[PDB]
Amino acid sequence: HMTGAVCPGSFDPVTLGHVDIFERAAAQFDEVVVAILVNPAKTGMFDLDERIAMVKESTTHLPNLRVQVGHGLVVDFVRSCGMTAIVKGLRTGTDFEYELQMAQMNKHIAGVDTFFVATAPRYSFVSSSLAKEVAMLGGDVSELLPEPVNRRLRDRLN
Amino acid sequence: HMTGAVCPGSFDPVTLGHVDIFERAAAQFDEVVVAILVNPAKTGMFDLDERIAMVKESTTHLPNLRVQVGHGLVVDFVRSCGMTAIVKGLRTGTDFEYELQMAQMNKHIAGVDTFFVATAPRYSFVSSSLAKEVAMLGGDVSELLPEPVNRRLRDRLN
Amino acid sequence: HMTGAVCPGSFDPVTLGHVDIFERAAAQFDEVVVAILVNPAKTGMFDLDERIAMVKESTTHLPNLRVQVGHGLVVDFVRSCGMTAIVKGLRTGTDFEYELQMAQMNKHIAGVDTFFVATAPRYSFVSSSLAKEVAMLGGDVSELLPEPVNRRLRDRLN
Amino acid sequence: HMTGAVCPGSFDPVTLGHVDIFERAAAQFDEVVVAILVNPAKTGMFDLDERIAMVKESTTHLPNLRVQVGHGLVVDFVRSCGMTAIVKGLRTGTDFEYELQMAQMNKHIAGVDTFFVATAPRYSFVSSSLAKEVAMLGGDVSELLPEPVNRRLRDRLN
Amino acid sequence: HMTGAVCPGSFDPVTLGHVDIFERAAAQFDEVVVAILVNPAKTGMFDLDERIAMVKESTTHLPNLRVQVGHGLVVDFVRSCGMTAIVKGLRTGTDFEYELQMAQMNKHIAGVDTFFVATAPRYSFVSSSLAKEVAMLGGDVSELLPEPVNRRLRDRLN
Amino acid sequence: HMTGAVCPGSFDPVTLGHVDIFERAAAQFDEVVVAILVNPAKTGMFDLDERIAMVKESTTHLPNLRVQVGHGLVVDFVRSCGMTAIVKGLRTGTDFEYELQMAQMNKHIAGVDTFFVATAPRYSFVSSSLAKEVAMLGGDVSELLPEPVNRRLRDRLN
Ligand SMILES: CC(C)(COP(=O)(O)O)[C@@H](O)C(=O)NCCC(=O)NCCS
Ligand SMILES: CC(C)(COP(=O)(O)O)[C@@H](O)C(=O)NCCC(=O)NCCS
Ligand SMILES: CC(C)(COP(=O)(O)O)[C@@H](O)C(=O)NCCC(=O)NCCS
Ligand SMILES: CC(C)(COP(=O)(O)O)[C@@H](O)C(=O)NCCC(=O)NCCS
Ligand SMILES: CC(C)(COP(=O)(O)O)[C@@H](O)C(=O)NCCC(=O)NCCS
Ligand SMILES: CC(C)(COP(=O)(O)O)[C@@H](O)C(=O)NCCC(=O)NCCS
Numbered sequence: 001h002m003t004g005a006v007c008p009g010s011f012d013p014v015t016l017g018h019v020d021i022f023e024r025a026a027a028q029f030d031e032v033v034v035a036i037l038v039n040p041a042k043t044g045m046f047d048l049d050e051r052i053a054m055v056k057e058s059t060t061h062l063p064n065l066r067v068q069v070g071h072g073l074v075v076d077f078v079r080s081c082g083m084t085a086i087v088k089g090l091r092t093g094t095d096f097e098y099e100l101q102m103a104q105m106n107k108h109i110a111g112v113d114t115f116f117v118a119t120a121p122r123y124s125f126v127s128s129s130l131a132k133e134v135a136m137l138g139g140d141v142s143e144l145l146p147e148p149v150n151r152r153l154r155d156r157l158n
Numbered sequence: 159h160m161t162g163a164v165c166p167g168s169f170d171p172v173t174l175g176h177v178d179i180f181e182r183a184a185a186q187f188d189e190v191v192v193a194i195l196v197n198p199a200k201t202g203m204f205d206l207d208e209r210i211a212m213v214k215e216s217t218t219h220l221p222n223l224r225v226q227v228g229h230g231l232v233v234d235f236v237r238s239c240g241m242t243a244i245v246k247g248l249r250t251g252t253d254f255e256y257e258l259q260m261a262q263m264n265k266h267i268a269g270v271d272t273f274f275v276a277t278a279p280r281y282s283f284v285s286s287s288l289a290k291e292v293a294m295l296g297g298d299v300s301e302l303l304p305e306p307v308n309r310r311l312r313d314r315l316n
Numbered sequence: 317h318m319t320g321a322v323c324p325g326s327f328d329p330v331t332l333g334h335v336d337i338f339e340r341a342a343a344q345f346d347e348v349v350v351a352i353l354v355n356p357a358k359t360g361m362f363d364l365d366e367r368i369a370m371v372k373e374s375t376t377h378l379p380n381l382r383v384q385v386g387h388g389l390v391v392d393f394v395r396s397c398g399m400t401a402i403v404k405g406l407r408t409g410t411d412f413e414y415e416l417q418m419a420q421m422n423k424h425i426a427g428v429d430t431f432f433v434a435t436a437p438r439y440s441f442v443s444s445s446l447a448k449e450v451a452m453l454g455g456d457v458s459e460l461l462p463e464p465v466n467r468r469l470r471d472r473l474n
Numbered sequence: 475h476m477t478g479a480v481c482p483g484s485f486d487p488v489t490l491g492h493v494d495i496f497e498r499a500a501a502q503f504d505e506v507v508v509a510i511l512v513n514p515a516k517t518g519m520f521d522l523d524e525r526i527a528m529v530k531e532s533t534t535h536l537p538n539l540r541v542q543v544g545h546g547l548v549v550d551f552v553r554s555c556g557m558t559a560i561v562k563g564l565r566t567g568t569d570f571e572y573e574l575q576m577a578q579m580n581k582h583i584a585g586v587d588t589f590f591v592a593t594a595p596r597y598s599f600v601s602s603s604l605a606k607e608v609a610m611l612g613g614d615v616s617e618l619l620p621e622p623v624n625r626r627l628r629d630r631l632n
Numbered sequence: 633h634m635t636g637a638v639c640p641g642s643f644d645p646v647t648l649g650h651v652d653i654f655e656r657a658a659a660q661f662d663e664v665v666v667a668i669l670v671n672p673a674k675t676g677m678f679d680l681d682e683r684i685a686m687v688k689e690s691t692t693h694l695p696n697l698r699v700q701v702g703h704g705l706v707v708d709f710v711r712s713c714g715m716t717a718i719v720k721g722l723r724t725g726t727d728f729e730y731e732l733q734m735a736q737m738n739k740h741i742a743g744v745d746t747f748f749v750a751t752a753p754r755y756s757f758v759s760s761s762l763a764k765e766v767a768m769l770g771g772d773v774s775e776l777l778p779e780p781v782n783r784r785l786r787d788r789l790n
Numbered sequence: 791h792m793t794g795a796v797c798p799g800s801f802d803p804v805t806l807g808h809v810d811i812f813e814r815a816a817a818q819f820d821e822v823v824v825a826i827l828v829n830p831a832k833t834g835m836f837d838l839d840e841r842i843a844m845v846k847e848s849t850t851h852l853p854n855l856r857v858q859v860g861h862g863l864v865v866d867f868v869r870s871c872g873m874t875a876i877v878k879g880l881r882t883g884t885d886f887e888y889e890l891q892m893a894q895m896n897k898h899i900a901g902v903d904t905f906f907v908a909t910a911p912r913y914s915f916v917s918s919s920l921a922k923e924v925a926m927l928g929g930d931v932s933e934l935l936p937e938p939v940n941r942r943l944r945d946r947l948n
């Protein structure tokens with residue numbers, strides 16, 4: 001009877017584009033799980049613990065959302081939660097053809113459905129990679145990231 | 159804790175691509191409403207009552223799905239159902255940029271979220287318009303349409 | 317040393333997406349001409365004089381912008397102004413491949429350059445056609461259109 | 475060991491973009507058939523006999539190419555020629571997603587393969603529709619159309 | 633008199649999407665050559681010998697196809713075969729703009745034509761990279777790869 | 791009163807596609823600055839000094855253009871020139887969604903406008919990366935690059 005969606009990603013760091021999508025999922029599904037899946041072949045900026053903390057600290061307003069680590073196939077994580085749905089955001093710059101390819105693959109291997117939702121226009125041009133690039137060069141992306149992330153970026157400059 | 163999505167469209171006629179999406183919505187939301195909205199400036203093949211019957215007859219396996227007519231804004235229909243979500247299918251040939259434009263407009267005017275889902279590959283190249291075109295020229299699209307639709311299409315050539 | 321761009325379109329009616337682009341052109345070129353060209357085979361809502369008035373009334377803050385009518389090729393209009401550049405806006409739902417085709421054709425036939433600019437995100441999902449559709453069905457698009465347009469749109473439902 | 479492709483379209487009128495593709499097909503297949511199929515619900519400029527003549531007159535340098543009319547499904551035309559392949563050109567402004575949809579539909583209903591080829595850059599921005607539009611407004615598209623077409627287009631303005 | 637196409641790629645490993653395209657090329661050209669071109673700057677999973685063996689073992693049903701190694705420009709390989717045509721598959725996730733760029737480049741430098749064909753829907757979401765990723769994480773992509781490839785992936789787990 | 795645009799890039803090496811765009815910018819803005827911004831995380835082929843020299847040597851026909859190095863955010867460079875406009879070219883293979891994302895980001899952080907222009911068809915399929923790849927394998931891309939670049943590539947073979 002209880003519905004549910006997983007919002008998977010690398011979240012290095014989580015942005016307000018991601019939070020917008022978490023909010024939509026939390027509004028439309030009984031339970032939401034944010035799954036952090038780190039790429040074993042891309043050294044990111046933030047370690048796993050920091051990524052988890054940034055998501056948790058940025059989602060306290062969503063009572064029906066929790067945050068977990070995923071270690072293998074996203075579909076294995078989804079099924080482990082007793083769920084069969086993934087929610088993914090679309091923004092300016094999304095590789096949509098690759099998202100579609102992954103969605104079809106995920107449906108084939110595990111029967112998991114993927115629902116795509118367009119990010120709010122004001123948060124439609126932030127991405128983790130571009131936010132880091134701009135921030136590291138001294139640009140102000142603070143309006144595009146949650147305050148828990150802004151705090152950690154400010155300390156990353158030190 | 160009750161969740162819900164509306165699957166809106168003109169469904170002239172409903173295809174197995176549409177049914178695939180109804181199935182995904184019905185699996186992931188507590189209730190689904192198929193909303194038939196007609197373009198008052200379009201040369202529809204089937205009248206509204208035939209469209210309703212085809213959708214109903216093609217969805218008897220989905221116990222939490224109902225079929226209704228809308229006469230104005232899709233967002234007004236969605237809210238009249240006590241819902242705030244739309245589910246739309248993607249296929250080969252979808253005008254995705256227009257779908258994105260409508261999704262953003264619908265969110266702006268009424269706060270309604272739109273979730274997009276990729277149709278199953280076998281049903282990814284049928285559309286109402288192309289099915290009608292092929293059928294009228296004697297082609298066999300019966301594997302891409304529900305039997306309630308095939309029946310009526312066959313009676314149109316009789 | 318005098319520079320200039322033409323912003324052509326049907327503007328039926330002008331939107332805040334269009335005004336955003338007029339503003340960018342006016343900031344970057346010495347003179348801007350808004351060129352209203354009407355599709356002689358299109359069911360326009362507003363007559364040419366109403367379209368001109370709406371553009372003029374919506375651009376009083378741009379001192380280097382003027383509004384004129386064109387009756388043939390956009391390139392012939394551009395050259396009649398003593399200019400060789402067109403500025404076109406991009407939004408969610410733009411048929412960009414057609415815009416690219418026209419740009420290449422316009423360069424071929426008359427040497428006229430086309431510059432494309434992305435509309436501000438808040439105005440990225442309004443279009444003349446969708447604004448009219450929503451307004452006629454009772455939806456509120458007033459935040460996406462200039463007040464001179466809202467006034468006339470309200471008088472059309474009166 | 476005999477190979478063959480059909481190049482279908484409305485060719486109203488044939489352009490140098492189309493001729494470029496005919497040339498590639500003729501270089502790569504033993505026989506090529508240009509198939510003229512008319513949209514019975516389209517306001518074509520040139521009648522079917524004029525379209526045939528323009529194609530024939532523009533392809534005299536291709537000895538393994540013939541021109542024929544089709545009246546129903548393109549796949550039925552292709553099979554009537556003893557062939558199982560279609561060659562379609564891509565240009566700036568092509569509705570590629572619709573082309574992909576038709577290709578998949580054509581393969582489904584008749585087993586016919588579709589091969590897409592990018593038009594030469596110099597001919598990549600002409601289309602029948604845009605050429606007619608520009609020509610009717612007095613623009614010079616003569617470098618983008620075969621001389622047999624230019625002749626007839628000039629006689630239409632006479 | 634004999635027609636021919638080259639199907640180039642890295643094939644690390646060959647998938648059923650690739651085989652589908654080989655089948656189309658073999659049906660429409662007198663001879664087909666699969667050319668394996670290894671990227672000297674991307675350590676793949678399978679060495680050149682294994683890639684060749686997987687393609688050969690997966691194409692025994694295509695009597696007019698052979699498999700060869702290419703060492704430099706794909707167009708140099710194509711011309712060395714006495715051919716002037718390349719056939720490339722399209723799938724969900726194809727970087728089509730890059731494929732188009734390469735096609736135009738290949739035509740410019742060597743006069744070689746590229747024909748694109750859409751993969752069968754059931755094989756439209758497999759790619760070499762995604763199949764490896766899923767397989768390495770214990771997912772079942774065996775329905776998307778030829779048995780000669782499945783055998784080698786099973787041994788890669790050991 | 792003086793208008794201006796910056797044409798930023800990595801230019802490793804500059805191509806005739808880039809020069810085409812420099813020419814358009816120089817025709818439409820009082821002053822143009824080509825800004826070379828080297829990626830600190832991608833070893834290119836040519837060092838910064840060589841990149842600058844190739845651009846300068848290839849633009850002597852543009853009296854109102856100068857060439858400079860940028861060291862951080864492109865928007866910081868643009869504002870340092872007393873300008874607020876960037877001009878970027880589009881070609882076959884452009885990652886347009888990423889260009890749009892950067893344009894929206896650049897507008898957000900610094901109020902800088904980006905104008906996109908389509909490259910001339912004959913120069914629409916060259917890119918720095920593809921030109922290097924083809925040249926290094928002995929292909930002739932000399933018609934797609936300025937002679938100052940061709941000279942340095944010939945010496946790179948030695
Ligand atoms: C984590 C992610 C969703 C990518 O997320 P990101 O775009 O936020 O980096 C994707 O890499 C993923 O699902 N990884 C787990 C591995 C997997 O399941 N691969 C199969 C994809 S079909
Ligand atoms: C019915 C439909 C979803 C289109 O469906 P279709 O693609 O199945 O024909 C769309 O035309 C619609 O929403 N119509 C109702 C009017 C409306 O709400 N218009 C504003 C859209 S932003
Ligand atoms: C007016 C417009 C720019 C379209 O504008 P719109 O998209 O705002 O309706 C276009 O239809 C146009 O240029 N019309 C004039 C005729 C012409 O020049 N046609 C040839 C175009 S390559
Ligand atoms: C003729 C054409 C190829 C379109 O050609 P055009 O783009 O040159 O106008 C297409 O309309 C067609 O195939 N018509 C015949 C009817 C048909 O087969 N329809 C089904 C297509 S999947
Ligand atoms: C091998 C391939 C076709 C890529 O194939 P892939 O997409 O299967 O990896 C491409 O990298 C290639 O053609 N390489 C040979 C080098 C070359 O010719 N480069 C020039 C391209 S225009
Ligand atoms: C230099 C370039 C324009 C890329 O140019 P290229 O596409 O020619 O390599 C881009 O990497 C850039 O702007 N770099 C400076 C760093 C920056 O400003 N990043 C923020 C982008 S929003």
Ligand code: NI
Nearest residue numbers: 001002159160
């Ligand atoms: Ni519930």
Ligand code: NI
Nearest residue numbers: 317318791792
């Ligand atoms: Ni000036």
Ligand code: NI
Nearest residue numbers: 475476633634
């Ligand atoms: Ni033969």
